[PDB]
Write a protein that binds this ligand. Structure first.
Ligand SMILES: *C(=O)CCCCCCCCCCCCC
Ligand SMILES: *C(=O)CCCCCCCCCCCCC
Lengths: 108, 119, 536, 122, 41, 41
C-alpha cells in the first residue's frame, strides 16, 4: 500500500530483467487501446480506442489477498496430461537445480 | 456392438425422439419423453439391423421399419466414417492391449525354450 | 519406584569429583557395597578384553557378600565370555544381560545375583540368544544408517537421503506449455515423490526466488526408476499462491517422532519390498493400493504389478509403461471386479481390514470370499494385512481398542473401526480354503531391520516405541500364504509354551538344512543329526 | 532421396565406402522426403484441430508442430553407401530415431486423447 | 450453453449461428491417412 | 555361420549380436507400393 524504496527497487528490478515485452496491445501516442471484453470502461473523450487483440489470454475476476506463510508449505502433487521425456525433464532440472546444496541433519 | 451409443444407434435415437415427441403434442402430454429408454431402444434397433440387415423389409419390426430410420441411419453412418480420426481403435484398446501383452508373455515363454534346448 | 533409598553412595572412576579416583582394571583399596554399579568404558580387542575381564573382576570384588555388581561390558566377545564364566564362574548367583539400546552400540550390562562364593554361573542358551539378538540388530541398524550422509558434507547426488531442490526466479509455471520453469517442476517432483515436496517464495529486493526442495530418498529412486516418463503437475495450485513464505530449510529429518502407526507401516514397506524382490514372483496385483499407488516404490522396477482402488489413481498412469504397471478401478470386495484380472500373487495390505468394515461384513467371512477369488485369479502367493490378536487379546490404550462384544478394532478409538478375526478360528478357516497351501505369520521383528524405512526416508522416532509397534504389529500380522508348498503340522495346535510339540516339514530330500528362526534371529538350525536349539 | 542419411566417415572425399550411416546418441537420422511430411503433417493437423478441447480440459501441452521432431542435417542420403552416394542433400530435414519415437508415441498419446472426445462430439 | 467468452473464437449460443447442411460440402475430418509400409516409406 | 569379414558390416556369429523383438518397431520392408494407374500418374 505504501511502496517503500526496497519494494520499488524490487519492482524496477523485476522490470529490467530480460523478458518479453507484452504485445497484445500495440502502443499509440494519442490513444490507449483497451480490451472491449475488459472491466475497464473508457472515460469519454478521444483518448480510448476499443482495440481488441486477436487472442488475449486474460479473463476477469479478482483475488482475495492471503497473508504470508509462516513456514514452507508442502504441496501435494497432482499431475497434468502432457509428460516430459526423461532426457529433457532431466537437464531441465539440472539447469535450475540447487546441486551442491548445504543441508542440516537435525535429529533422526 | 458395445454400450458406446455410437453414431449409428445415435442417428436413430434422434428420430425416435422427434417422432415420439410430436406424437405427444396435443392432449395432456402426461409423458415427458424418456431418453435413457429411447437411447437403449434405438441401440437395439441399430444393432438388430447390423445383425440381420434383411429384417428392415419385414412388416412388423420395431423402429427399424418406420420411414425415417435407414434413410436416417445410413446418412449418419455416412458422416460417421468421414471423421473416425485415425485412433478409432481406442475402443476397448485396453483389453485389446492386455490381450497382446498376454501373447508376448507366452511368446517370451517360447524363446525361453529355444534358448535352453538348443544351448 | 521399587528401589529403596541407599544409606550412602560412594563415587569412584576417573573424574568422580566427589570420591577417590580408582582404576577398576587393577585392585581397589575400598570396602564392599550392596550394589556396585560399574559403568566404565573399555575403549585393540585382546587387551581390551583383558581390561573388561579385569574390571568386572574387581567390581565383582567390591560387592558386599550377597550384593549386586553391575558391570558394563563394551564388546561381549565370545573371547571374554569364556574368561568371565571361568574366573567368576562362582562369585555370584544370578546373571542378566540388560542391553539398553539408546544408540547403536554393542555395550551390554551384566548384573550379578548374590555375591556368594559358591555360585555357578554357567553360560546358557539364553546368552547365545541374547548375544545373537544384539548383533542381529547392529546389522539392521547399520544397514539402515548407510542411507544417511556424513555431517557437514555439501549435498551431492551421491547421498541416498540427500535433499535436492530447484530454485527458480520469478518462475512462470504455465499449463499446457513446457517452459523451463514448469519443466523443472516436473523432474523435481518425480525425483522425490513419496516424500514431502515443500515449496517456498522469499521476496528479494530484486526478483522473487522460489525453491522447491524435497527429501530424495531410496524410496523415490525405486519409484522414479519405474517411471518411463516424467509427468507434469497442475501448476494451478502453485500459480494461485502469490504470497511470500519463509525461506527454505533443507533438513534431512523432520522434527517429531513418527506415529506408532507409521513405525508399523514402514515395517511392511520393508517386508513387501523384500518379498516382491523375489524373482519367480512375476506378475503381482494389489487389492486396494492407496489412491496413489504407494506400492510402486516397494517393488523391483522390473516386476509387473497392477495396483487397484475404488478411487481414481493419483499418478498419471500413462507415464508408466503399460506392460509393467496396470491400474484397475473399483473395489475388489464386489464380485464383478474379478473378471479378467489374473495375477500369480496378490497383496491386500492396509485394505483387507477396511473392506470388511466398508462391506459391513464379518472378517472371517470376508476373506472367505477373497482368498478363493485370488486362487481363481491365478495366484500362487498372498499377503494380507489382516488384523487378528495372535499374540494376545490385550490391546493398546491409545492405538487400538479391542471391543470384545463384537469382534472389532478401534484404531485411535473411533478414527476408524474395522472387524477382526481370532488367531485360531481364522487360521483354520483359511487352511480349509487353501488346504495344500503353507501359511505363515510375518510380523514387525524386534531386530528393527525395517529401519531403512523410517531413518531411511528421514523421519524421527522413539527407541521406546519400537516396543509399541512390535506390539501393534502383533495385533495386526501379515498372513503370508503360499499355495506353492506343503503346509506345516503342529501336533498341539494351540501349542502351549513348555510342552513338547510335533512339527513336520514334508520335504522329499533328507539332504536339507532345517533352520527355524523367530524374531529375525535364527534359533534352531541343523541337518537331522545335529540341531542347535536356543528356543528349547 | 530416401532412407537414412550417411556421411563420409573418412572425411571430405565421399566415395562408395568412405560413407557410413551417420548414427549417434539420438539414433540414425532418416530422411523425411516431401510426401512423408504430408502424412505426419496430415496426422498432426487432425490433432491440432482439437486445440480448444485440449486447453479446456488442461490435457495436451500446446499445438504439435512437426518441426519439433525433425532437424536440418546434411549429407548423402540413401539405402546403402553405394546408392546413397547419388543423393547429396544439403540441409535436408531428417528425423532421428529417438525422435521417430516421440512423433510416434505423441501422435499415439494425443490420438487417444482426441479419439475419446471426438467420440462424444459425434 | 452457458456463455464462455474467449476460450474459443465462437460462443455456441452466440448471436446468429446457423445449422444448415449443404449438399455441397459433406463434413469430413481425416480418417483415411495412409500409413501402410510401402506407402509411408 | 563361418566367419566372412568384410563383405557385409556385420558378422552373423559376430560378437554381442542380439535377437530381441520390441512391440515398438514391427519389422517391415516396402510391400504396399502404390502403382495403380490414377495414383502412379
Ligand atoms: C449448454 O451446454 C446447453 C447445451 C447446448 C449444447 C450442448 C451440446 C449439444 C450441441 C452440440 C454443439 C457442438 C457440436 C454438436
Ligand atoms: C552358418 O551359416 C551357421 C548357420 C547360422 C545362420 C544360418 C541361417 C539361420 C539364421 C538366419 C540369420 C539371418 C536372418 C534369419
Amino acid at each position: 500500500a505504501i511502496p517503500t524504496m526496497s519494494d520499488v527497487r524490487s519492482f524496477v528490478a523485476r522490470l529490467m530483467a530480460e523478458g518479453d515485452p507484452q504485445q497484445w496491445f500495440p502502443y499509440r501516442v494519442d490513444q490507449i487501446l483497451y480490451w472491449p471484453e475488459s472491466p475497464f470502461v473508457p472515460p469519454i473523450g478521444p483518448f480510448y480506442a476499443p482495440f481488441r487483440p486477436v487472442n488475449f489470454p486474460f479473463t476477469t475476476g479478482s483475488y482475495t489477498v492471503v497473508p504470508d506463510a509462516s513456514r514452507p508449505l508442502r504441496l501435494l502433487p497432482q499431475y497434468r496430461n502432457a509428460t516430459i521425456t526423461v532426457q529433457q525433464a532431466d537437464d531441465a532440472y539440472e539447469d535450475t537445480a540447487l546441486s551442491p546444496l548445504i543441508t542440516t541433519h537435525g535429529f533422526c | 456392438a458395445s454400450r458406446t451409443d455410437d453414431s449409428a444407434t445415435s442417428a436413430i435415437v434422434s428420430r425416435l425422439a422427434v417422432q415420439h415427441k410430436l406424437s405427444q403434442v396435443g392432449q395432456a402430454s402426461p409423458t415427458p419423453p424418456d431418453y435413457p429408454l429411447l437411447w437403449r431402444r434405438a441401440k437395439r434397433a441399430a444393432s438388430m439391423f447390423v445383425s440381420n440387415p434383411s429384417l428392415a423389409l419385414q412388416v412388423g419390426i420395431p423402429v427399424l421399419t418406420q420411414s425415417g430410420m435407414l434413410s436416417a441411419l445410413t446418412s449418419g453412418v455416412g458422416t460417421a466414417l468421414r471423421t473416425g480420426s485415425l485412433g478409432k481403435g481406442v475402443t476397448d484398446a485396453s483389453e485389446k492391449l492386455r490381450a497382446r501383452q498376454s501373447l508376448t508373455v507366452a511368446k517370451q515363454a517360447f524363446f525361453d525354450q529355444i534358448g535352453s534346448l538348443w544351448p | 519406584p521399587g528401589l529403596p533409598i541407599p544409606r550412602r553412595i560412594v563415587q569412584f572412576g576417573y573424574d568422580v569429583v566427589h570420591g577417590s579416583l580408582l582404576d577398576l582394571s587393577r585392585a581397589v583399596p575400598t570396602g564392599t557395597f550392596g550394589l556396585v554399579y560399574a559403568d566404565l568404558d573399555q575403549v585393540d580387542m585382546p587387551a581390551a578384553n583383558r581390561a573388561a575381564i579385569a574390571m568386572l573382576g574387581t567390581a565383582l570384588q567390591m560387592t558386599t557378600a550377597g550384593g549386586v555388581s553391575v558391570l558394563k561390558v563394551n564388546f561381549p566377545t565370545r573371547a571374554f565370555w569364556t574368561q568371565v564364566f571361568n574366573l567368576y564362574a562362582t562369585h555370584a548367583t544370578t546373571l542378566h544381560l540388560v542391553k539398553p539400546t539408546i544408540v547403536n552400540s554393542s555395550e551390554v550390562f551384566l548384573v550379578f545375583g548374590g555375591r556368594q562364593s559358591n555360585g555357578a554361573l554357567r553360560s546358557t542358551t539364553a546368552l547365545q540368544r541374547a548375544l545373537l539378538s544384539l548383533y542381529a540388530r547392529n546389522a539392521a541398524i547399520d544397514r539402515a544408517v548407510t542411507h544417511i550422509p556424513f555431517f557437514g558434507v555439501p549435498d551431492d547426488g551421491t547421498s541416498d537421503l540427500g535433499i535436492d531442490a530447484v530454485r527458480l526466479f520469478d518462475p512462470m509455471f504455465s499449463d499446457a506449455v513446457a517452459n523451463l520453469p514448469s519443466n523443472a517442476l516436473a523432474s523435481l517432483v518425480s525425483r522425490v515423490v513419496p516424500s514431502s515436496i515443500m515449496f517456498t517464495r522469499v521476496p528479494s529486493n530484486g526478483p522473487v526466488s522460489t525453491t522447491i526442495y524435497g527429501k530424495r530418498t531410496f524410496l523415490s529412486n525405486r519409484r522414479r526408476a519405474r517411471l518411463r516418463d516424467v509427468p507434469m503437475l497442475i501448476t494451478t495450485t502453485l500459480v494461485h499462491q502469490r504470497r511470500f513464505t519463509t525461506p527454505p530449510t533443507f533438513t534431512l529429518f523432520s522434527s517429531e517422532a513418527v506415529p506408532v502407526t507409521t513405525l508399523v507401516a514402514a515395517g511392511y514397506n520393508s517386508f513387501i519390498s523384500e518379498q516382491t524382490r523375489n524373482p519367480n514372483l512375476a506378475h503381482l496385483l494389489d487389492l486396494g493400493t492407496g489412491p496413489e499407488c504407494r506400492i510402486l516404490s516397494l517393488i523391483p522396477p522390473t516386476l509387473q504389478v497392477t495396483m487397484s482402488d475404488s478411487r481414481p489413481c493419483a499418478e498419471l498412469m500413462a507415464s508408466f509403461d503399460p506392460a509393467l504397471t496396470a491400474y484397475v478401478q473399483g473395489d475388489y470386495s464386489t464380485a464383478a471386479f474379478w473378471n479378467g484380472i489374473r495375477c500369480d500373487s496378490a497383496t491386500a495390505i492396509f485394505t483387507i481390514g477396511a473392506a470388511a468394515a466398508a462391506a459391513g461384513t464379518d472378517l472371517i467371512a470376508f476373506v472367505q470370499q477373497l482368498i478363493p477369488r485370488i486362487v481363481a485369479a491365478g495366484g500362487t502367493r498372498m499377503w494380507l494385512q489382516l488384523n487378528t490378536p495372535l499374540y494376545e487379546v490385550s490391546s493398546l490404550p491409545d492405538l487400538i481398542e479391542i471391543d470384545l462384544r463384537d469382534h472389532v478394532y478401534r484404531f485411535n478409538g473411533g478414527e476408524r473401526v474395522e472387524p477382526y478375526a481370532d488367531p485360531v478360528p481364522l487360521q483354520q478357516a483359511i487352511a480349509a480354503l487353501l488346504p495344500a497351501a503353507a501359511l505363515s505369520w510375518h510380523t514387525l521383528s524386534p531386530t528393527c531391520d525395517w529401519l531403512p524405512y523410517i531413518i531411511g526416508v528421514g523421519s524421527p522416532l522413539n527407541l521406546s516405541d519400537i516396543n509399541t509397534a512390535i506390539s501393534y504389529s502383533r495385533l495386526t500380522p501379515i498372513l503370508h500364504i503360499d499355495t506353492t508348498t506343503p503346509p506345516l503340522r503342529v501336533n498341539p495346535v494351540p501349542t502351549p509354551l513348555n510342552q513338547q510339540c510335533a512339527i513336520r516339514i514334508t520335504s522329499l530330500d533328507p539332504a536339507a538344512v532345517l533352520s527355524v528362526q523367530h524374531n529375525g534371529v535364527e534359533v534352531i538350525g541343523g541337518t537331522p543329526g545335529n540341531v542347535i536349539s536356543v528356543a528349547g | 532421396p530416401t532412407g537414412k542419411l550417411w556421411r563420409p566417415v573418412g572425411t571430405s572425399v565421399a566415395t562408395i565406402d568412405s560413407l557410413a550411416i551417420v548414427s549417434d546418441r539420438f539414433g540414425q537420422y532418416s530422411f523425411v522426403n516431401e510426401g512423408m511430411r504430408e502424412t505426419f503433417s496430415k496426422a498432426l493437423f487432425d490433432i491440432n484441430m482439437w486445440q480448444p478441447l485440449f486447453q479446456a480440459t488442461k490435457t495436451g501441452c500446446g499445438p504439435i508442430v512437426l518441426s519439433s521432431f525433425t532437424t536440418t542435417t546434411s549429407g548423402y542420403v540413401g539405402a546403402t553407401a553405394g546408392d546413397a552416394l547419388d543423393n547429396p542433400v544439403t540441409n535436408g530435414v531428417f528425423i532421428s530415431t529417438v525422435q521417430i519415437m516421440n512423433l510416434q508415441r505423441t501422435i499415439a498419446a494425443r490420438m487417444r486423447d482426441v479419439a475419446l472426445w471426438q467420440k462424444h462430439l459425434d | 450453453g452457458n456463455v464462455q467468452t474467449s476460450v474459443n473464437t465462437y460462443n455456441i449460443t452466440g448471436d446468429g449461428n446457423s445449422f444448415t447442411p449443404t449438399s455441397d460440402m459433406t463434413s469430413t475430418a481425416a480418417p483415411a491417412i495412409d500409413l501402410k509400409p510401402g506407402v509411408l516409406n
